[PDB]
């Protein structure tokens, strides 16, 4: 029967490193992490022509309309015709020696093309990836979400197909081929829920604050610094740490909230009153308790 909305004024997330310069090869992928900020999703999507997406325990439209504790993006230059080599359970060199997607958090894999005139991203000369990485053969495979152990060796650069570099203990080999047409990229996105007192929010999901003072003891929808739900609020003596802002019980259900007005509110799920019916068949009449 109402809405309870409280949000803090935050800065804008910094995506400029991704939108300027040359994206790296896959084995040297760049990672960005965001917390306690807002970002314009509609603008970002209009800079790219998506060719495929695959998500796990989340959907892109929910990312557009809700908030999360943090947002991690790994990105690199990647030819779209090699898409199958990034699939889970692939047996090829991409997963073994370059990038292996982690599935411990909700995650989505996106491939896209950079339109020729639209952006300030610059093209590399070649696409590139590693074909092997071994200790003298004792192969060394990527951990999920990690970097290849051969990363330092590979930074010497690759000038021809199947050129090798060694340092005495590690050896790695590289493959290169030219970029033709518009540049193509890959993005690996993951989010977390309920690990911070503040949130990351798309700009389209923001709403004006409202008060709870005239809505006590009734069921309302709430959005408190990105944490949403339904519940009934009541003014209470303060318990728990105010600077942690949220109080939970043993089942990890929210039971309290410290407001920026200075008060503490007990929180309960929406309740329903019992009803019983007394019926007499002979007279066909009824009453209620």
């Amino acid at each position: 029967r109402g809405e309870f909305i409280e949000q803090a004024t935050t800065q804008e997330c910094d995506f400029t490193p991704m939108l300027t310069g040359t994206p790296p090869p896959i084995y040297n992928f760049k990672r960005l992490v965001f917390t306690n900020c807002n970002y314009n999703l509609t603008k970002l999507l209009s800079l790219f022509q998506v060719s495929e997406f695959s998500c796990h325990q989340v959907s892109p439209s929910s990312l557009a309309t809700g908030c999360y504790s943090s947002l991690t993006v790994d990105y690199f230059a990647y030819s779209t015709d090699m898409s199958s080599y990034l699939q889970p359970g692939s047996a090829g060199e991409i997963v073994q020696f370059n990038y292996k997607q982690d599935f411990s958090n909700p995650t989505c894999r996106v491939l896209a093309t950079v339109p020729q005139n639209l952006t300030t991203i610059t093209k590399p000369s070649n696409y590139a990836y590693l074909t092997e990485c071994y200790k003298t053969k004792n192969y060394l495979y990527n951990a999920p979400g990690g970097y290849t152990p051969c990363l330092s060796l590979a930074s010497r650069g690759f000038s021809t197909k199947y050129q090798s570099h060694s340092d005495g203990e590690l050896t790695t080999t590289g493959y290169i081929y030219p970029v033709t047409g518009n540049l193509q990229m890959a993005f690996i996105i993951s989010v977390q829920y309920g690990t911070d007192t503040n949130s990351v929010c798309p700009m389209q999901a923001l709403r004006n604050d409202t008060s709870i003072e005239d809505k006590l003891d009734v069921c309302v929808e709430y959005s408190l610094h990105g944490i949403t739900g339904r519940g009934v609020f009541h003014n209470c003596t303060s318990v728990g740490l105010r600077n942690q802002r949220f109080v939970y019980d043993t089942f990890d259900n929210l039971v309290g909230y410290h407001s920026y007005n200075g008060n503490y509110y007990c929180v309960r799920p929406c309740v329903s009153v019992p009803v019983s019916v007394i019926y007499d068949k002979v007279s066909n009449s009824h009453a209620t308790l």
């Binding site: 325990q57 989340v58 959907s59 439209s61 929910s62 809700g66 949403t228 739900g229």
Partner: protein, 49 residues
């Protein structure tokens, strides 16, 4: 005394029935959450249903 222990056991059986009833609402049964509000917030049809 055994009889007093039996009294306390009867009371405890009554309490345990209710506690087991309430605890089952936190079982995910292999879904992404035990809360319907979270499921509606994070997924879309047909995966939602």
């Amino acid at each position: 005394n055994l009889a007093f222990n039996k009294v306390q056991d009867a009371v405890n059986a009554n309490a345990m029935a209710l506690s087991k009833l309430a605890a089952e609402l936190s079982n995910t049964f292999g879904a992404i959450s035990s809360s319907i509000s979270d499921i509606l917030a994070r997924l879309d049809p047909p995966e939602q249903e």
